[PDB]
Curated annotation (Swiss-Prot), chain C:
Belongs to the ATPase inhibitor family. Residues 1-19 are annotated as: Disordered. The chain holds residues 30 to 77 of 108 of the full protein. Forms an alpha-helical dimer with monomers associated via an antiparallel alpha-helical coiled coil composed of residues 74-106, leaving each N-terminal inhibitory region (residues 26-52) accessible for interaction with an F1 catalytic domain. The inhibitory N-terminal region (residues 26-52) binds the alpha(ADP-bound)-beta(ADP-bound) (ATP5F1A-ATP5F1B) interface of F1-ATPase, and also contact the central gamma subunit (ATP5F1C). Residues 1-23 are annotated as: N-terminal inhibitory region. The gene is ATP5IF1. It comes from the Eukaryota. Endogenous F(1)F(o)-ATPase inhibitor limiting ATP depletion when the mitochondrial membrane potential falls below a threshold and the F(1)F(o)-ATP synthase starts hydrolyzing ATP to pump protons out of the mitochondrial matrix. Required to avoid the consumption of cellular ATP when the F(1)F(o)-ATP synthase enzyme acts as an ATP hydrolase. Indirectly acts as a regulator of heme synthesis in erythroid tissues: regulates heme synthesis by modulating the mitochondrial pH and redox potential, allowing FECH to efficiently catalyze the incorporation of iron into protoporphyrin IX to produce heme. It is found in: Mitochondrion. This is ATPase inhibitor, mitochondrial. Homodimer; represents the active form and is present at a pH value below 6.5. Homotetramer; represents the inactive form and is present at a pH value above 7.0.
Length: 189, 272, 48, 186, 186
């Protein structure tokens, strides 16, 4: 593996940008074939089957993806703080799901309910309709620039959309379309 | 029967046990305070009912129907606390309908409304909510009594059902009669009191209703807490029992995997 | 360190009875609130 | 194994009926030896140690035994409906074990308690005393006709015996012996 | 393992005794490495850190260590009864310590308050100073014969020394120095 991989590089005479697809047998990331491949990469995206069964596409695992340029001195401070703030609340969501199993949903404190409500809305907003999947979903694709991506999550973290249902954040592009979807949902009710 | 399934199933119960274990102490801490405040309210509750005790009053055979009140909370995981009350609530109505009355049932506590909704949906007069989260107070009994009189329904008889705290490991279900009807109150035995009037008796019955309601609530809360503590103890005992067999199964499978994977290497080395 | 150590979210990863029981309750509880939120949105927008 | 098994058949000159006993090493059904014999059979009967621990004899697993002639057009409609109903009731009770083992019986609603009681009553009635075991069990052998079994299971499924204790359906023959043993055990 | 361990025995001229340290891989007591060793052992000694937290030295767990010559036919009758009683009292004290953390100290009956004090004294009579650490702590070492140990524990179990304070039994040798040290205090 090492002999072949070392030839795909950007030397001082030119540049090569490579994208490689890797298969994991039986969803086991400790298998010797994918295990000895993490060392040869600069950015990884891990797809998961649990997320796909909820209906969220693309099924990217948000707590198991990494990059090398995720540094405050390369992408700025605002972009860095937003991502770390998202990951922290997504990690905190998991611990609350053990309590709900034994004692019901309504016995939780109000702060826990607010945390869960914000986390569920954050989870939906990460999905997006693609352009090559118009046959499957039946919608037209979307593209989102970077500034809208930062601002939409910063606003949801602030708490400016606590008066909207979850369904308005599902399969949309920018943040401006969720309220326009909620207004139509209200009109059709 | 693979190693992954055993590992996941072990890791779930390991968390369930700790959740139950942490939930036991909170019920003990609440039970301490619930027991502390019962003694001052017991003398008040007994003192409210002395007059009816001394001068016996018996209701006649009328047809103004009853007013059955059942007390409970909005939380589960307390053994058979609610089922015992809901058992007698439906028992009394059969005898009441044998004579024939327009009886109605009022329940404070959501579980009581939920259990008996299917078969007694029409008899429901009014129900309350937000009970058990915080300790009860006299103002809640005042609110319930105030909202009970404004109803156009009128009754000649009534009863209230509750659980009475007896010991840290036992309790008894009981009910007490209500003679709040003015007409039945005015009987021969009341002639000894010689400064009475209709207005005075109306106010007196009004106050006795709130007194009985407050006494019943302060009796029921302690029994509910003392039952939840025992339930949360038994659940952790069962979880500790399960996590002991799963470990032995895990160890046996772990050894078997190593032996099976070594045999293949030896066999593929010998055939060269 | 040698034994089996659990983590966070292990109850919903095994997919037993408790995981589905946990999922349905959240689904119901958050299915209930959207009606109130939509009704208040319609009333607010009609008022102004 | 295929060379030996293919000779025990029924042809256009006669008939042969085979009854074979098979062994499973270390209580494992995925072992290569007993896992290739399933394809050479027309009827299967699987025995379990856990059932034998509870005292039910014969220890036949009711959710793991099959036959090739269980269809409405051979055994009739009524027999098939009764068998499918009892199997559905048995399957439903198995899915509540985790909750009962920890939280307890009080958390169930009324219908779940009713299904638990009916399944526990049905489990007892499947046991039976054998004649060849009378010497070391102190009982008497029994032999039931088919119609009585069908009717006895129909009656239990209909709820006609919900007022009897569950211990009266243990080690008896026809259904009439359950009411008499319950009457004595007042 | 057999060829080595069979050379440590007691012949007519003398004897050899061995003390060995054990490490259990993966906390599995059925692993082939420690399971083969346990067939040759005649005793165990468990050292814990919780005992060391209280300030007990040597930190030997009394309820977790075991022997094999602990039988009336070998060590005698009086020794066995005394060593049984100490284990009984120390076992019940640990169970009642759970009650005192939930219901409170007032739920204890009259006998419980006496058993607690006797257990608390016994848990401190088990410590002892060593000679090899003489210079560091400035205390003489003590070497108690077996008879004084039996008598000292028997007299505490009777209830005779039920008026001296707890700290008289801490870091002492035979029983006399405890009453002398209690005399010096107060």
């Amino acid at each position: 593996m090492g002999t072949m991989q070392e030839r795909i590089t950007t030397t001082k005479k030119g540049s090569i940008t490579s994208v490689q697809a890797i298969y994991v047998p039986a969803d086991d990331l400790t298998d010797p074939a994918p295990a000895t491949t993490f060392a040869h990469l600069d950015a990884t995206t891990v797809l998961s089957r649990a997320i796909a069964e909820l209906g969220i596409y693309p099924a990217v695992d948000p707590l198991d993806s990494t990059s090398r340029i995720m540094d405050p001195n390369i992408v700025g401070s605002e972009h860095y703080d937003v991502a770390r703030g998202v990951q922290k609340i997504l990690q905190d969501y998991k611990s609350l799901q053990d309590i709900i199993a034994i004692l019901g949903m309504d016995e939780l404190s109000e702060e826990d309910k607010l945390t869960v409500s914000r986390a569920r809305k954050i989870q939906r907003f990460l999905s997006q309709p693609f352009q090559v999947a118009e046959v499957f979903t039946g919608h037209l694709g979307k593209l989102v620039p970077l500034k809208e991506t930062i601002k939409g999550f910063q606003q949801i973290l602030a708490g400016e959309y606590d008066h909207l249902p979850e369904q308005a954040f599902y399969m949309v592009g920018p943040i401006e379309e969720a309220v326009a979807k909620a207004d139509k949902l209200a009109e059709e009710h | 029967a693979t190693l992954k399934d055993i590992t996941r199933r072990l890791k779930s119960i390991k968390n369930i046990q700790k959740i139950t274990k942490s939930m036991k102490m909170v019920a003990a801490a609440k039970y301490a305070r619930a027991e502390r405040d019962l003694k001052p309210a017991r003398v008040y509750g007994i003192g409210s009912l002395a007059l009816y005790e001394k001068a016996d009053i018996k209701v006649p055979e009328d047809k103004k129907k009853h007013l059955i009140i059942g007390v409970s909370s909005d939380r589960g995981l307390c053994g058979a606390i609610h089922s015992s009350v809901a058992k007698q609530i439906k028992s009394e109505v059969a005898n009441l309908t044998a004579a024939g009355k327009e009886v109605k049932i009022v329940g404070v506590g959501d579980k009581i409304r939920g259990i008996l909704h299917r078969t007694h949906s029409d008899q429901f007069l009014v129900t309350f909510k937000e009970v058990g989260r915080k300790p009860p107070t006299f103002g809640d009994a005042s609110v319930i009594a105030l909202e009970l009189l404004n109803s156009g329904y009128e009754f000649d008889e009534g009863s209230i059902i509750f659980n009475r705290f007896r010991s840290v490991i036992s309790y008894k279900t009981e009910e007490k009669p209500i003679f709040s009807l003015d007409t039945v109150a005015s009987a021969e035995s009341m002639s000894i009191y010689d400064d009475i009037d209709a207005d005075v008796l109306r106010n007196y019955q009004e106050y006795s209703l709130a007194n009985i309601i407050y006494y019943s609530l302060k009796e029921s809360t302690t029994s509910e807490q003392s039952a939840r503590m025992t339930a949360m103890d038994n659940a952790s005992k069962n979880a500790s029992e399960m996590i002991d067999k799963l470990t032995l199964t895990f160890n046996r499978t772990r050894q078997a995997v190593i032996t099976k994977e070594l045999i293949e290497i030896i066999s593929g080395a010998a055939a060269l | 360190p040698e034994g089996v150590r659990s983590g966070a979210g292990a109850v919903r990863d095994a997919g037993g009875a408790f995981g589905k029981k946990e999922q349905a309750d959240e689904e119901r509880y958050f299915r209930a609130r959207a009606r109130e939120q939509l009704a208040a949105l319609k009333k607010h927008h009609e008022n102004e």
